[model samples]
Target chain A: IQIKSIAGITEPTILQYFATLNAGEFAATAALFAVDGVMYPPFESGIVGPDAIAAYLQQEAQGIKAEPQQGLAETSEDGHTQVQVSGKAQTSWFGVNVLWLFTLNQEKQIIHTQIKLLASPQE
Target chain B: AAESLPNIQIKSIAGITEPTILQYFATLNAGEFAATAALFAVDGVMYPPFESGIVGPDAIAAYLQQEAQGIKAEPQQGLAETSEDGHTQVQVSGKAQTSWFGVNVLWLFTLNQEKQIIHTQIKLLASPQ
Candidate 1:
């Protein structure tokens, strides 16, 4: 399922936003979205608006650490785009694991993100 | 100032030519595919889905001839939506009868300026029970 464009955002911008999210800059990450922006994480209810998005991230991003050790995959047109950032996320529930598959909108903001928790770390 | 190229409607979902082409695919006619290959640009690319990508008119013709040996198909439905940037998007749903199986498929095509096809992708949506 593909979500169309959002405001002035392009696909590359959305991919960059995920990079910042991996850097653990929750507030700055949320700021990438427009005032009426929306995010739909896989298997979760949609988060709407910038203020609400920030609040949700503030709580969810706690102790959620990530490192960018993988290359970024992308596809796009002039103003629209989609990207996938694969890496490991250190969280309370899942220890070190692989997380892949994320989708972004035209304004370079994340519209949907999916994280897969690996069962065990490989050597 | 530089002279501008003619503003031909290069990509448009409402265009008549593409749908007519889709209708042709539904019939699984080798002659139609051959004729459509003529409409592509010299450097055009065609992705037959589950098959190798074909580049250029000659490659396209050769690929179609090679694959046309087995299969029967017909159009089911087609939906088209254009982006604000004038990227014409088309989703052509069709049914096919192959030597191995009968299935439904969705084929997508995107055309670029110069009024030539730039990209095409296809996916098998379902198979008859």
Candidate 2:
């Protein structure tokens, strides 16, 4: 769950996206992101570029999985130009729950969006 | 400005739109949870991450007023766009500075005839302390 799309992400555009890949996908997952789009996985710093994002996702999501999350929609600051859809994920593979975020673009294609660790079963 | 934005006829519901909702954000700073909940439908429900659903405007008000004692949402910015659904959809996100720490708050809304919020879901992008 997210509220501060402080970075000013815009649109329902990206929110629907995560739903499509909630369980995880292969090369196809990278297709929606802009070439320079970025993704902050549940681990480490975010990775950049579609190629890099797909590559990292391949292994990172191997045993770990993201739950289908319906982001709460918002134009963020009520800006017509943008919207931020944020939600949560549950994973049994790694015992960590991830929080996801996305900002849409008119092009329809967006960044791998953003992700952060919210919880882990492990200490 | 329209160059990269969605080309849909975004509709307004319950008279709530980008600016009016921003007014909702304004109340958070004043710690006016009761008034904040006032904008919601009498039967509307609230969803908070890691928490139980708070139903109705009264409970919504009670929940906030009691738990929001020192919780302060520091004003911030984000995009605002309502989808052009026959029923309408609203979304908002930003930062909240609580008595203990800072948290991001995400809110999604659906409206009724009076332009009152019928369904309001909320969540926090947070991590373990």
Computed on C-alphas against the true complex, the DockQ of each candidate is: 0.03, 0.09
Best-matching candidate per DockQ: 2
User: What is the per-residue lDDT of model 2 for residues B1-129, given as tens digits with 9 covering 90 to 100?
Assistant: 758744223343333356446555656557778777887776677665566667777898898887867766543433343344444455555566766778766656656545666665555543211
Q: At residue A44, give the lDDT of candidate 2.
A: 75
Candidate lDDT values, in order: 0.53, 0.55
Model 1: CA > 4 A from native: A1-123, B1-30, B99-101, B127-129
TM-score per candidate: 0.42, 0.49
Q: Would you give me the overall lDDT of model 1? A: 0.53
lDDT of 1 by residue, B34-70 (tens): 6667656676677776555678778787777787657
Error of 1 at B120 (Å): 1.2
lDDT per residue, candidate 2, A30-93, as tens digits? 7777777777765578787778877887877654434433334333333322233333454664
Q: Model 2 residue B14 lDDT? A: 30
Cα error of candidate 1 at position A83, Å:
22
**Shift in Å, residue A67, candidate 1:** 26
Per-prediction interface RMSD in Å: 15.7, 11.6
